[PDB]
Amino acid sequence: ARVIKVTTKFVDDEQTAKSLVKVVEAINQRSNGTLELQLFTSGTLPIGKDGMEQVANGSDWILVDGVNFLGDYVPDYNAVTGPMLYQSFEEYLRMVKTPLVQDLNAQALEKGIKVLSLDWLFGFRNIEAKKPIKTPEDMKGLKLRVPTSQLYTFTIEAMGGNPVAMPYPDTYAALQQGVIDGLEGSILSFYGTKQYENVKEYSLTRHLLGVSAVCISKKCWDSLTDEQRTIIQEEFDKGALDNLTETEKLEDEYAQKLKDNGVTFHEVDAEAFNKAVAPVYDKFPKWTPGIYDKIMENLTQIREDIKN
């Protein structure tokens, strides 16, 4: 039986990790004993940059982490996941299916990474701090934790704050010791990881979309049989779907629990933050020329169809 390590940042309480358990269950059983996927959560195995380096280098390894980690190999990914880019899940889910992004998946395959899915949404990310934010002026001074990614660092700097890059498992201690003053993330993350025990003011900037890619090494993928590739693809797709509808169901429920734990939700000057992050799109030289303009062309098209 072929052992494949599935590694992820998500703690056991988070929806993504709950969905991954079902996915591994199903894949292992459908393989009639030929595959043994093993799920490692909470960053117990390498994640982010160290995780993807394993995928890219041919390991028997599936990584479930941000789309931004694909971008260290195929730069255009960070543009497709830009700040204030999407207003809804459906906008992103459709962008992902365009030939523009399917081409990105193939550039990634040149690099040793087989992208199985970009559909593992977990929500729009907001400020989790100790003061309300209405404007970028308010952000001034705050040491805010960001994921280890240029896109997140640049975005938060552009919003007025001082980004401090670290993997999520390091956040709790950083908050306890005063190294950081807050962080950012979606409702499901906020509640799932219980950060409301440390920070009570939640400001709705909706700056980025929290979204995981699911990636397996080209070398392992190619070495499998046809039936095994079918089973793995089908089950991660069914998982993406489970994860998505659970996320849509839980956001409302969780926000109410967050309020019951003394979290106050704050509205933001949307127009201001929008003008504030616009320079982030001019901060990546390795993007293919005109990528923002082509993204916008699809996004505009996608929006028209949604209205109709």
207 binds ligand G3P (CB under 6 A): no
14 binds ligand G3P (CB under 6 A): yes
| 150-158 and 270-277 helices, crossing angle to 10° | 130
Q: Are 15 and 41 in contact (CB under 8 A)?
A: no
**132 is in the binding site of which of Zn ion, ligand G3P, none (Cβ under 5 to 8 A by kind)?**
Zn ion
Torsion 203-124-41-262 (CA) sign: positive
**12 is in the binding site of which of ligand G3P, Zn ion, none (Cβ under 5 to 8 A by kind)?**
Zn ion
DSSP assignments along 90-108, one per residue: HHHHHHTTSHHHHHHHHHH
DSSP 175: H
For the chain, the residues before each gap (C–N > 2.5 Å) are none
234 binds Zn ion (CB under 5 A): no
98: tokens are: 């365009």
- Of 7-15, 83-91, 250-258, 280-288, the window that binds ligand G3P (rule: CB under 6 A) is 7-15
Q: Are 48 and 10 in contact (CB under 8 A)?
A: no
Single out the residue of 61, 168, 221, 273 in contact with ligand G3P (rule: CB under 6 A). 168
Query: Taking CB positions, which residue lies at the least distance from Zn ion?
Result: 266
State which of positions 121-150 bind ligand G3P (CB under 6 A): 147
CB of residue 76 vs ligand G3P: minimum separation in angstroms?
20
What angle is formed at CA 99 by the lines to CA 95 and CA 103, rounded to 5 degrees? 110
CB of residue 226 vs Zn ion: minimum separation in angstroms?
25
How far is 199 from 181, CA to CA, in rounded Å?
A: 9
266 binds Zn ion (CB under 5 A): yes
132 binds Zn ion (CB under 5 A): yes
State which of positions 47-66 bind ligand G3P (CB under 6 A): 66
β-strand 35-40 against 2-8: which pairing, if any?
A: parallel
82 binds ligand G3P (CB under 6 A): no
CB of residue 123 vs Zn ion: minimum separation in angstroms?
17
Residue type, 199: V
Which residues sit in the known binding site? 9, 12, 14, 25, 90, 125, 145, 266, 282
How far is 282 from 18, CA to CA, in rounded Å?
A: 38
Single out the residue of 51, 82, 185, 239 in contact with ligand G3P (rule: CB under 6 A). 185
- Of 104-112, 169-177, 226-234, 259-267, the window that binds Zn ion (rule: CB under 5 A) is 259-267
Strands (DSSP E) contained in 13-171 are: 35-40, 61-66, 113-129, 143-146, 162-165
**236 is in the binding site of which of ligand G3P, Zn ion, none (Cβ under 5 to 8 A by kind)?**
none
11 binds ligand G3P (CB under 6 A): yes
How far is 83 from 276, CA to CA, in rounded Å?
A: 10
By the criterion CB under 5 A, which residues form the site for Zn ion?
12, 25, 132, 266, 281-282
By the criterion CB under 6 A, which residues form the site for ligand G3P?
9-11, 14, 66, 147, 168, 185, 189, 193, 210
